[PDB]
């Protein structure tokens, strides 16, 4: 679960507590724990008796969180809360890293999200891939409170401006039914109102001045596409990196699977930008 | 197991930048160590819960294969541990 | 029709071209056109068929937000008029006949037939008067696809074709069309197989071990019955 | 999924992509496709490896969709996404 | 039927209520529909 | 309801007042990113 | 990049480093005036 900007205390009180009240009693459960950090993230681990079906455990747990979601804070459930069974056996950890310094952990982690994550999770034998490093891209609008208050504006006003002015919308069609006679043409209408870049967001209009000039978001805020989480860094050999943890699904050939993921990484080798390479700092299949 | 697990706890209320500095120092300590091929660093990672706390950090020392090493992983552990016990900024450790 | 329900054509190929770089819908349509031409001029397979058509006309309604604030009309009221009048709005449910049905609000048919109709719907400004929205919108014409197709998370276009089992079997027609895909190819755009093709493209072929072990088992039980490692062959060689 | 009044592009970008993002990672999924029509309708087909249990596939897909629902536009949420297993076993077709 | 796997039955009933949710009133779909395997058997009762 | 009406108040008024005055709130922390100069301390903020 | 991401709104780091920074945030009263929040709140050091 996520609760951006929340104290561990109130995450425990208003997110962990009602959840726990819901999941308690789930079939075959041995015990559960809840960790609520100051990064606004709650992680609840439910451990079941050995021999329990992991998929069945997952469906039961999500049933109980589905019952629970009605009493969670609005902003908690607006981000969604994800229930997923854990693959315990790690088969390989890879790292994307930038030896010189062109790329930071943000760029490499999101490149992992965009180019190697999806084409690794569809390999024959994986059970779960995990990303460790920085966070997903997010359009950060860094407000200056003083400049906002100078124009007689409140944080709520700015947020409602961003919400009103960054929306898709469904413009319908020209020549659709009902009609007194058959139409000749069908034409769909596009009325795009979604912003795509930092400059457009900075161009949001907040108010009109006594000047008559348009007060804009970049007048009171710095706009960037930064990270959605500033809570965890990743470095390989003291260079910026992102760590990919690969976990095989039970019944697989760990040696063959590690060879497969290594060869796949070598295939994505052709499409990396320069100053970004990859390593496998740990291979636990060698033992077998 | 071809790797070592080291970490650091910094004073309560510390920032992630201080943990980053300490973690980078122990990483380079591990690199200057023989037989340690890699210093996989995650400042901000708590090894016990694998949650994110601002005053803790983890670093795995990925060891070279034995046929290229000339020290047992326990001896690398003792050497790296003697090296990072010199850090006064916080409480650092390295274990098997 | 097909021999079975759920796989595709008979012998042949199903293929998807996908764009991983953002080349746009026109580039995808040109790719599918050039491909289909290449498949046609290959002697065996005929012209392939697709549902992708990037040349569907449509109208783009851009908004002047500066002129919007100048005229005192809210951006959400403009988008709301567009939405409810032209695209219909879901209001709520009602019960009738013992069932539950949708209530839909939309402009009647003959008030959303022309661009003047788009210009003519009216929303309210901060002065409280009713103002047409055509002054603040710029309706232009553009060409795009309908339906929009995605395959494996990227924009894509389908391509299923007839076969020629008397000319080019699907197994090597597959690598043929792979050579064509490398031929007519922008970087950042590729092909991926689907339906039976995916199977043939990714199968861990096991027949090449079932056939040996089968003949081995036959020869072995024959040897058992014949007390000879040489007599069973006198039967296994008579089948070809 | 239904986005009444939406054109194929807005449906693809604001309904199909988040749903595909939430579905990707479901086990035994061999491929998937999304079709967005001018009628305001999105049909996303996830095909799994042969021998997969269609009921487990359906419940897992529906669970991921349900968790993605909150990031979907309000009227799409209000209309409701539906997950269902597709059957090839046509036995009879009857017309009135 | 006796001898049926209650877990498989639960999952199938759950899938079908999920598919039927869009044909129900919005006020119902909003509140969510629960599907639990259950025997109406009160196995025992503890009194305080 | 007689007293609530005697104060010119409605059931909706009192209900919304209760909604608006018993609520959890998130309040972030001091010394958090992004900073041009690295911070020493990270101090969580609790508003109740 | 073909995916979807959140857009977030927060004070830039250098404006949320101190207690006085919290006390200095301003908002609107019932007569349209911009008032800082420090006058209506108490801010206390604690541990957790
Ligand atoms: C060296 C890597 C492999 C280590 C082996 C893992 C075994 C440890 C016990 C299993 C617990 C793993 O628990 C793992 O917690 C991490 C916390 O970063 C989550 O990982 C997360 O990292 C980043 C940054 O925080 C998030 O933006 C992202 O969404 C998520 O992937 C994983 O989703 C969860 O599975
Ligand atoms: C006189 C009345 C006759 C009524 C006949 C009704 C049967 C008609 C069937 C149409 C053709 C059958 O051919 C079949 O087409 C369907 C629909 O595209 C394809 O189906 C494909 O798309 C559908 C649509 O999402 C997916 O669910 C499916 O997994 C995929 O394979 C099959 O792969 C192909 O085998």
Author numbering:
A (entry chain A): 49 to 336
B (entry chain A): 577 to 672
C (entry chain B): 673 to 912
D (entry chain B): 49 to 144
E (entry chain C): 97 to 144
F (entry chain C): 193 to 240
G (entry chain A): 769 to 816
What does the paper say about this structure?
Resistance nodulation and cell division (RND) efflux pumps are secondary active antiporters that are ubiquitous across all domains of life. As part of tripartite multidrug efflux systems in Gram-negative bacteria, they span the entire cell envelope and export a broad variety of structurally and chemically unrelated toxic substrates. During drug efflux, AcrB undergoes a functional rotation where each of the three protomers sequentially cycles through the conformational states loose (L), tight (T) and open (O). Substrates can enter the PD through several channels and bind to the access pocket (AP) in the L state and the deep binding pocket (DBP) in the T state.
